[PDB]
């Protein structure tokens, strides 16, 4: 709430505004192909998934019954994001303690 925290507004140079719009106009298209490579790769497996199902349909009907069947062991799943560097096999940080604030 302190007004001494407020920073003065630096004037944005006209040439700097030019490179903002140039990168904005390329950001929109860059994400478009990012979606474009996404939209093709979902359908690529989707059609490959269905043909495998229909090929297995002709192979055996009993297998198809247990193929589309829900697997109850699924969805305890957990996945964590990657890291900047691979973890160090030998690394022992000093002792410490945690606390919770609610």
């Amino acid at each position: 709430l302190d007004k001494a925290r407020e920073r003065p507004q630096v004037e944005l140079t006209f040439e700097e505004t030019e490179r903002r719009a140039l990168l904005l106009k390329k950001w929109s298209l860059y994400k478009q192909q990012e979606r474009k490579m996404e939209r093709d790769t979902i359908r690529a497996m989707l059609e490959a998934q269905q043909e495998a199902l229909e090929e297995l349909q002709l192979e055996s009907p009993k297998l198809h019954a247990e193929a589309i069947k829900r697997d109850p062991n699924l969805f305890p799943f957990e996945k964590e994001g990657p890291h900047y560097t691979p973890p160090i096999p030998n690394y022992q940080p000093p002792e410490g303690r945690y606390n919770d604030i609610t």
């Binding site: 969805f75 305890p76 957990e78």
Partner: peptide, 10 residues
């Protein structure tokens, strides 16, 4: 999945 975030399905 981005950097440093964890997902879970349940």
């Amino acid at each position: 999945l981005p950097e440093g975030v964890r997902l879970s399905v349940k």
